[model samples]
Each structure stands twice: as structure tokens, then as C-alpha cells.
Target: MRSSAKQEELVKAFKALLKEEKFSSQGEIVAALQEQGFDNINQSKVSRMLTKFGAVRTRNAKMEMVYCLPAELGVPTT
Candidate 1:
């Protein structure tokens, strides 16, 4: 339930980034989102947004939990 265009854009870029690599924490995602012109983004909001958009949380190569958008998010395959 994103309310603004900024939120929509932020999530769009997030979906795009997922195609390129993995993100291990909300801090990492919040940083990247800021680079994309999204402000007021915090770990909790990012956590909620990820869940809202169907981003999955699972273990990474080092057994660290990470968030990833599923391929059906309307972006190119990742």
C-alpha cells in the first residue's frame, strides 16, 4: 500500500536492482533508494514495502538473510 509516486518509483528501482545483485539488509536498500531520490526511507518502511511487493527474505551464500523481488514483479527477469 504505497501512497506516493516516490514510493512507487523507489520500488521500481528496487525491482530493477534485484536483477543485478543481492541486498542483505534494509540499510543497504535504504541507501540505494536515497540515491534514486527517495528520502524518508527507513528500515521499517523498506521492510514493509518489500513484504507489500512480494519481496522474499531468504538466506544468502554466507547464510545471511536477504530480501529479493520475485521475477513476476513486472520487471525484466532476475
Candidate 2:
């Protein structure tokens, strides 16, 4: 079982990746997490994380659909 601290660390890394990169697929996000030394990262895990983070897929400046946090879209959070 993963501890809360490990889960928090993963969330932090996950947010950083979302903010700094434009990921068009869950595979790319999982690969980035692996590069950051996370173990057992997969599409399912990434999907859950994105849901918990309130991330949405939106079109970027180049009109490419990518995952983005709500704040990045300038929407007020409740």
C-alpha cells in the first residue's frame, strides 16, 4: 500500500507536468512520470489523477487538444 506522503509526491509531480507540458495522451504523461522516477505508473493511474485534479482536455494555441488544469484556463475554482 502506498503511503499518503508518496501519494502527495505523485500529485505534486503530476501537477508540475501538467503545467509545464502539453500532453496529448495518457501514455505520454505516464512516460513523463516514469522519467521522474515514479514506479508502476500507467494509463489508469494517470486517468484517475487527472480526474482528481479537475484537469480537462482543451485546445491550445496551436489548436491541439491537451490536458490542462482549471486554473490554467483562468476559471475560478469553487
Candidate 3:
């Protein structure tokens, strides 16, 4: 369940990104997070947490790195 506020902000932002942008990597997620007010988002943390939680989008770019969620989405599951 969401907290005592309009929960649409985050949901809308993420949905818009998924609907609009071509986020080929987690870097774009971090950049978006920065735009969303996370200035100190490190790559490892973003790769491990946000992507893993399904809060960000990622994909394999041929052979460079198989960028993706480190694990299944927990909140969306529960």
C-alpha cells in the first residue's frame, strides 16, 4: 500500500518513462532519478536497488553488459 499522499507522482513518472523513453541502460534511470531529486545516486546502488525493485528500466545491449534487474520486484509482487 502507498502512504498518505497522492501516490500517482512516482507511478505516473515511471509509467511515462516506460511509455516514452528508450532507456537502453540503467544510466538513463540514474539520470532520470537525478531529475527526480536523487543527486547522490551511484551506479552500483542504482543497478542493484532501483532496477532490482523494478523502479527502473534496463536491457541487454548486444554484448557489452546484460543490464537488468538483479532480482524480482518485491513491492509490485506484494
Candidate 4:
């Protein structure tokens, strides 16, 4: 299925953010996306995207709980 152009843009930006930085809350993600020029970003949108991306809330080296992709955490899919 084809996705909306805006959704495509959102996915790209979201993945980049996940790979580069850690966010502990959906509000933070909405703020980041807004900084990137995306409008209408909200906690609900971020929650759905996080589910689609299989992101998990886990602790970092600093022991802070943050959202991350399984691959980023070196989690074996198998």
C-alpha cells in the first residue's frame, strides 16, 4: 500500500532520530519532529509510529529509560 507523502517524510525523520538520539517520552519526539518542520505532530501519532517501528523503552548506559529500536540495542531477532 502507498503511504501519504507526509507519512513517508515522518518515517524518515523518525528513524533518523531513533538512530541518533534517545527520547524518553512521546512529547519529546513530537517536539523534535516539529523542529524538523513537521506540523500536527502529537503524542498519539508518535505512539503509533513507535509501535510500527518496534521501538522499545529500555535503559541506556546512563541508566535512563529511553526509546530505541531493537537493532540499536543489539537484540537478536532470532
- Best prediction by lDDT: 2
lDDT of 2 by residue, 1-78 (tens): 755433556777787778764898788899999989899799999988787677878888899888777674323232
Sorted on TM-score, highest at the top, how do the candidates line up? Answer: 2, 4, 1, 3
To one decimal, what is the Cα RMSD in angstroms of model 2 from the true structure?
A: 5.7
Model 1 stretches astray by more than 4 angstroms = 1-7, 58-65, 74-78
> Which wins on TM-score, candidate 3 or candidate 4?
4
Q: What is the TM-score (0 to 1) of candidate 3? A: 0.42
Ranking by lDDT: 2, 4, 1, 3
Candidate 4 residue-wise lDDT, 3-59, digit = tens: 645456777678777765578888988899999989878999898888867787888
Which residues of candidate 3, in runs, are more than 4 Å off?
Answer: 1-21, 54-72, 76-78
What clash pairs does model 4 have? none
Badly placed stretches (over 4 Å) of model 4 are: 1-6, 72-78
lDDT of each: 0.69, 0.77, 0.51, 0.76
Clashing residue pairs in candidate 1, if any? none
Which pairs, if any, clash in model 3?
none
Candidates 2 and 3, the one with greater lDDT: 2
Between 1 and 4, whose TM-score is larger?
4
